[PDB]
Each structure stands twice: as structure tokens, then as C-alpha cells.
Amino acid sequence: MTFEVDPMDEPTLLYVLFEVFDVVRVHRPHRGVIETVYLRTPFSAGNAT
Amino acid sequence: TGIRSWTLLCTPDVTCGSEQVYWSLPDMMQDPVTFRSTRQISNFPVVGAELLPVHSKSFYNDQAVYSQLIRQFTSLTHVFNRFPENQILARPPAPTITTVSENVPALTDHGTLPLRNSIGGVQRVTITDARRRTCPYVYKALGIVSPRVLSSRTF
Amino acid sequence: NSIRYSELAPLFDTTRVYLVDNKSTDVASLNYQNDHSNFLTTVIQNNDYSPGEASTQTINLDDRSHWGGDLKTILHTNMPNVNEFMFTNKFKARVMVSRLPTKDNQVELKYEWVEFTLPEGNYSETMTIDLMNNAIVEHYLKVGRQNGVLESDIGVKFDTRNFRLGFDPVTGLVMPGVYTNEAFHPDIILLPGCGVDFTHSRLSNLLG
Amino acid sequence: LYPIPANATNVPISIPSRNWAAFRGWAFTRLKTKETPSLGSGYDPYYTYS
Amino acid sequence: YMPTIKEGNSRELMGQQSMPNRPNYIAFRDNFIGLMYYNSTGNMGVLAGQASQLNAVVDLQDRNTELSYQLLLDSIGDRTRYFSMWNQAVDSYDPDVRII
């Protein structure tokens, strides 16, 4: 990507918020047990695949 | 009934004993049998233990006391021996079997501990001292892990 | 057995993952106040990604197999002999604090447990004992001279000689008249009303 | 986030070779470096703005 | 306006003036933003069975929950109203001051 912006006299950051998918599945088999299966596809992270 | 009843004369050590230093990898290795996962530094599960890499070494100057007098003259100052003449308070002679601390490199081995099925991007390494206080004197640290299959879960 | 990472192909059993500290320099932000004692490091190394990124991806080991890992650790430190953290720079010793004549011409000898400090870092045994004696001398200087405490009655003095070497049971004194200058073991010399404490100090081991 | 030096005008960036399954879209803005604290840290030694 | 840098009482100092100091408010964020640690692997919330071991909260370094709440909140309902329970009072400028 190539952005072009107007000059400024102080440091600035460009924030690109790549939009993505990000879901969590909550698994609770027994009493007092929580299991989570994360996922975030376009920037892969989590358990399932 | 004297002091010998409840005191033991041990050989002097510069290190003043040695403290076992524990290892903690709270996000990769499964916790031990009785520990519980917590975010307190102090209690981080202990997945490894080894002696602190600091030990005394023995050096021998027998001419020691002579050496000491040399030391004083070269020092240019009486200082340490401020009451030269009174015998009782005079500068104690240097031991002839004096010891010096040393920072030996350490490379230990810990057998195998079960680890979480999904390791993580930012694992945390923590070395704690005896009383679970992080030791500010550690120059390098490094961890090497070789995952392998242990058993299965499908019957 | 399929230990798999997102971008790359699924590797098979018995690979290696490294926890190093310079990777900390990389996600610097995360450990702005941490030391080598405890830190957050990026396990993930791919060279495509810039050093900052790629630290959010996770390594997955297949759930159907209960996974265990070998561990080998490398440690090399530099700790001085006398320091604040290891309870070696401090020690408590009760000493004479003030010697002032009273109205009844009967001298009164006060006492006070005063904590001492040692410049951190001095090392050898000899020097250490000597320093400790330095501190004592110091307390006298700050207060004895002031309250008029004679230097003869310094309560605590460190030494290593065997004072009974020249002792003769026949007479009860030391015939040579001077204690031999040969060190044996760290020991403490006390005076009435004075003493030494090591409840929260570790130099005990050094004095042996 | 990506830094932009003072009085700069062109900002080339590169996203290295990932899978783009199920990607949705973009969204972007510009922020002053002073007003964006370095998140993830317990304490920012340089953050001096409120 | 300080007429003369000389200190102590003087006629010039009698000739001085004054001016009120600038206003400056201080309070918490729009939704107590920053009070609770978010998206910080160093300090991450944990929620699991007391009994078990594995945490059920995994927080990546680059996700941003704060902003999200701030948006959702915008999406589900009006933000112009103020809810004092969570300081829910969205910041806004005077539109006759932003443009002149």
C-alpha cells in the first residue's frame, strides 16, 4: 500500500485497521470447566486450523 | 552449657551460602502437580530448579600476613587500622586459605514436563530466587525446548 | 504428531523452539520495566515479518496427542559479593552509644542496636571483615566522640586470631606478651552490654 | 500502526505475503504520536500527554 | 502584565494588571477507558475454572477492545445521552468552535 498525506511538523502514525474475522467459541463440558477456541483468519492466531 | 551447644563453626564462604534458583515458563509448560496457575510473579509455577551459578574458589597466599603489611603501606593510608598499637583492636591478619566468589556459567538439564497444546506468541520466562524475588543480577538466559509425543487421548 | 504453524507447512514431531532475551529487545514495548530475570520474548521467528510483528501467531500442537517437552536452560550471571538484594550489606550490632558522667559521679553507659550498611561491592574476605570493622569505627566516630565515649571501650570488634595461643596455664597470662598474627577463623569480640544480631542479615555465613 | 517522520509526505508500507482468506476490508486514519501511548506496557516512561 | 521586574512594593507594581487562568478540567475517560488493562500480554485478565488450569481469555497484542466498545456502544444506541453509571458521556466539541 502507498499513502500520501499532507506535511505536519510532528511525528504521526498511520493506523490501518485491517478488517478481519475474529470469533471465539466457548465450550463448557462439565461443571466449572471453560474451554475457548479462538480464531482470527486474515492475521492467523488462535487454536483451531 | 557454652556457646558450642547451639553454634557450629563452618568454613567461611564469600557467597554466604548458595540459593537455589527456580525456573518458570507459565505460558508454555503445564504446571506441576500441586501448583496452580497465577499471574503473580512470586508464585509462577516452578518447572525447573538449579543451583545459583555462583560458587567460592580457593586461593592460597601464605605469606598473607606479610602481604597485608605490603598492602597497607601501598595503600598510602592507615585507615583500616586506626588504632595501630592496641593489640586487641589491631588489623586482623588475612587468612591463608582465603576464598573468592566466581560467576561460573551454568548449563543445566531438566528431564521433561508436559506443555500446553497451543504454545504462544509471547512466552514468558522467569527466574526467581529463593524467596521468589526476581534476581536483578542475571546477565543472560536462554531456553531450549524439544516437544515430543507422550501419550494419546482417544479411546 | 502434526505440530503445525500457520504460515509454514506442518512439521512433524521433535522440533525446537527457543526462548532468548534479545527477542525482548524486539517487542520492546511489552517489557519496558523487565529484566533478564523475567521478560516476555517472541518465540516466533520468521524472517519475512518485521521484528515487531509475527509475535501474535501461535504454535499449535495437535490436541489428540498429549504433548511433552524436553528442556535445557542456559544461565550465566554476575552477582557481587556484598549487595542489598541478598541481605549482605546490612547487619545489626548493639554497641556503646554514650558515656556521660552523672550527678552522682557514677558514669552511665547507654546502649543502642544500630543497623549498619556496607558499600555494596567490596569483595574479598579480608576486605570485608575490615570494612565491617570500619563501620563500627564509624559509629564511634559519629557518636562517641560526641558523647564522649573513649575509643578503648568499643563494644564490637572483629578478629580471626586465637588469643589463647600464648596462654600459659602455669601463670595465667601470655608469656610472649603479644597475640600471634596468624588468622584461624572469623570471630567476634564483645564487651558487656554489647552484641551482634543476624536475624535479617546473611553475613553470617561469611563470618563462618 | 506505522510511523511518519516530521514533514513527511509519502508513506509506503508493505504487508508480507500472508493468506487473505475471508478478508473483509480496510479502515485507516492518522494520529499524533504524542497522543497514542505505547500499549501493552505496564508504564510508559515517555508518555507525557493526557 | 508585569511592569517592572524589581521586587517589593513600588509604584510600577501598583500599575500592574491581572488575568484569570485558563480553564482545565480533569476526570475519567468516556467509559473508564484505561482503568481496566486490555490487550496487554504482560498484564492480561484471567478467567477459568478455579479448579482447572487453562485460562479462557487469550488477548493478542494488536487487537483493540477499547475502540470496539466505543463503537458498539455507538451502534446499539444513542451516545448523545449521558449515563452516569459508567461515565458514559461521549466527548464532543462545540460545532460553532471547530468551524469559525
Full 3-state SS string of C20-53: CCHHHHHCHHHHCCCCCCEEEEECCCCCCCCCCC
Query: By C-alpha distance, which of C41, E26, A27, E17 is closest to B122?
Result: C41
Q: Where are the alpha helices (DSSP H) in chain B?
A: 64-75
Asked if B119 and B30 count as a contact pair (C-beta separation under 8 A), the reply is no
Q: What is the CA radius of gyration of chain D?
A: 15
Residue D25 contacts A where some CB pair is shorter than 8 Å = yes
Please, which residues have CB within 8 angstroms of residue C125's CB and are 6 or more apart in sequence?
A: B12, B14, B94, B95, B98, B99, C186, C206
Take residue A48 and report the three cell numbers written for it: 483451531
CA distance B149 to C17: 15
CA distance B88 to B85: 9
The owner of cell 461521549 is E90
Is E61 in contact with B39 (Cβ distance < 8 A)?
no
Cβ atoms within 10 Å, residue B98: 19
Cβ atoms within 10 Å, residue E56: 18
**Residues of A in Cβ contact (< 8 Å) with C6:** 44-45, 49
Q: Output the furthest CA–CA distance in chain E (Å, rounded).
A: 80
The owner of cell 585507615 is B79
Asked if B64 and B97 count as a contact pair (C-beta separation under 8 A), the reply is no
Distance from CA of A45 to the nearest CA of E (A): 8
CA distance D37 to D46: 9
Residue E39 contacts D where some CB pair is shorter than 8 Å = yes
Could you tell me the CA-to-CA distances from C164 to B97, B106, C122, C172, C175 in Å, in that order? Answer: 21, 44, 31, 10, 11
CA distance C114 to C156: 12
Asked if A3 and E23 count as a contact pair (C-beta separation under 8 A), the reply is no
State the method. Answer: cryo-EM
Could you tell me the CA-to-CA distances from E29 to B46, E33, E36 in Å, in that order? Answer: 40, 5, 12
Is D39 in contact with E41 (Cβ distance < 8 A)?
no
Take residue B80 and report the three cell numbers written for it: 583500616
**Residues of B in Cβ contact (< 8 Å) with C159:** 88, 92
**DSSP string covering C110-163:** EEEEEEEE--TT--SHHHHHHHHHHHHHHHIIIIIHHHT--TT--S-EEE---T
Asked if B56 and B14 count as a contact pair (C-beta separation under 8 A), the reply is yes
Phi, psi at B25, each rounded to 5°:
-130, 70
CA distance C186 to C175: 24
**Residues of B in Cβ contact (< 8 Å) with C40:** 122-124
For chain C, what percentages of helix, strand and coil (3-state, to nearest 5) are there? 15, 25, 55
3-state secondary structure of D34: helix
Q: Which helix (H) or strand (E) holds E68?
A: helix E65-76
Query: By C-alpha distance, which of C127, C94, C51, C118 is closest to C199?
Result: C94
CA distance C126 to B67: 12
Q: Which of D17, D19, D38 sits opposite C29 (nearest CB)?
A: D38
Asked if D31 and A16 count as a contact pair (C-beta separation under 8 A), the reply is no
A12-16/D2-4 β-pairing: antiparallel
Q: Which helix (H) or strand (E) holds E76?
A: helix E65-76
Residue B143 contacts C where some CB pair is shorter than 8 Å = yes
Is E41 in contact with C40 (Cβ distance < 8 A)?
yes
Residue B91 per-residue DSSP state:
P
- Residue B4 has, within 13 A of its CA and on its CB side, a CA count of 0
A2-4/D10-12 β-pairing: antiparallel
Nearest 5°: the CA angle D38, D43, D48 is 70
Could you tell me the CA-to-CA distances from C179 to B81, C4, C84, C160, C167 in Å, in that order? Answer: 16, 76, 36, 11, 9
CA distance C19 to C6: 19
Q: Which of A33, A38, A43 sits opposite E49 (nearest CB)?
A: A33
Is E39 in contact with D40 (Cβ distance < 8 A)?
yes
Query: By C-alpha distance, which of C36, C14, C16, C12 is closest to C24?
Result: C36
Query: By C-alpha distance, which of B30, D16, D3 is closest to C46?
Result: D16
The experimental resolution of this structure, in angstroms, equals 3.7
Asked if A23 and C36 count as a contact pair (C-beta separation under 8 A), the reply is no
- Residue C170 has, within 13 A of its CA and on its CB side, a CA count of 2
Q: Which helix (H) or strand (E) holds D2?
A: strand D2-4
Could you tell me the CA-to-CA distances from E36 to B39, C140, E33, E70 in Å, in that order? Answer: 16, 54, 7, 14
Residue D3 contacts E where some CB pair is shorter than 8 Å = no
Q: What is the CA radius of gyration of chain B?
A: 25
Residues 114-153 of chain B whose Cβ lies under 8 A from any Cβ of chain A: 117-118, 121
Cβ atoms within 10 Å, residue C15: 14
Q: What is the distance of C-alpha B61 from the center of its chain?
A: 26
Residues in C whose CB is inside 8 Å of some CB of E read 27, 30-31, 40, 55-56
CA distance D42 to D38: 10
Asked if C59 and B117 count as a contact pair (C-beta separation under 8 A), the reply is no
Q: What is the phi-psi region of residue C172: left when phi exceeds 0, alpha when psi lies from -120 to 50, beta otherwise?
A: left
Asked if C107 and B49 count as a contact pair (C-beta separation under 8 A), the reply is no
Could you tell me the CA-to-CA distances from D23 to A6, A44, C33, C57 in Å, in that order? Answer: 29, 11, 36, 17
Asked if C78 and B105 count as a contact pair (C-beta separation under 8 A), the reply is no
CA distance C137 to C139: 6
- Long-range interactions of C146-154: CB distance < 8 A, separation 24+: C147/C97, C147/C98, C147/C99, C147/C100, C148/C98, C148/C99, C148/C100, C149/C96, C149/C97, C149/C98, C149/C99, C150/C99, C151/B83, C152/B86, C153/C96, C153/C99, C153/C191, C154/B89, C154/C95, C154/C96, C154/C191
For the four alpha carbons of C139, C141, C147 and C148, in that order, the dihedral sign comes to positive
Q: What is the CA radius of gyration of chain C?
A: 30
